[PDB]
């Protein structure tokens, strides 16, 4: 649904891929673990490992990320955290 | 805040520390961002960096962890994911 | 820079008084948020910057206490 970016330390190209990848994942999958898995795998392929993704309606996180590889955004009411670490 | 461990790849001593640490965090802090932050910091100090913690009621994830440094458990209705990566 | 250890100690002694400003700002923020209609963009940005600076500052000091010697 509508993409709203709250935080990002990430290039413009990777930001757009984050939304696009999450958009496809959310359309294709219903289960959060599978939505997250789709998003992560796509980034590992195009932008190299090691990416991590959490997708959900209710969570907080405190993580460490690689510089220029962090975004936090919503698609409708669903929050997506997408970053590299390792 | 009763603790139930669902899955772990972690030594028994670190598993117990995770539950006790998360339990203390959950008693002290109301907001997941702060609970996660408490938990992460305690592990970086005692078990070296780089730790990551996600705390919440509704999420899925797909992550990569270091062997022997992974736990996923609940405190009551709140799920905590605690692992090392990087 | 065989003098800079003095500034190191001073910063450690000063921050216990300066750092509470952050919580004080939040405690008052509780009200500003409501009355200002959420128009707190400047406050949020500054808080985010502080988060960064505070974590970095502690990290440096934790290293300095051992590397400075």
């Amino acid at each position: 649904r509508k993409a709203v970016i709250k935080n990002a330390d990430m290039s413009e190209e990777m930001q757009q891929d984050s939304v696009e990848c999450a958009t496809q994942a959310l359309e294709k999958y219903n289960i959060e673990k599978d939505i997250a898995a789709h998003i992560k795998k796509e980034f590992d392929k195009k932008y190299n490992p090691t990416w991590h993704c959490i997708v959900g309606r209710n969570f907080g996180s405190y993580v460490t990320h690689e510089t220029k590889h962090f975004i936090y955004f919503y698609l409708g009411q669903v929050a997506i955290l997408l970053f590299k670490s390792g | 805040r009763k603790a139930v461990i669902k899955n772990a790849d972690m030594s028994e001593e670190m598993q117990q520390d995770s539950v006790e640490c998360a339990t203390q965090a959950l008693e002290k802090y109301n907001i997941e961002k702060d609970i996660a932050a408490h938990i992460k910091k305690e592990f970086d100090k005692k078990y070296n960096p780089t730790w990551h913690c996600i705390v919440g009621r509704n999420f899925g994830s797909y992550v990569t962890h270091e062997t022997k440094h992974f736990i996923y458990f609940y405190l009551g209705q709140v799920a905590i994911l605690l692992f090392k990566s990087g | 820079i065989g003098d800079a250890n003095l500034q190191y100690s001073k910063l450690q002694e000063r921050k216990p008084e300066i750092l509470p400003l952050f919580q004080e700002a939040e405690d008052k923020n509780r009200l500003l948020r409501t009355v200002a209609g959420g128009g707190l963009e400047t406050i949020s940005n500054l808080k985010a910057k502080w988060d960064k600076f505070e974590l970095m500052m502690e990290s440096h000091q934790l290293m300095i206490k051992d590397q400075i010697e």
Binding site: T64, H65, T67, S85 | - | -
Partner: peptide
Amino acid sequence: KNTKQAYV
């Protein structure tokens, strides 16, 4: 390494 801490 050049890493950063963050939270959501």
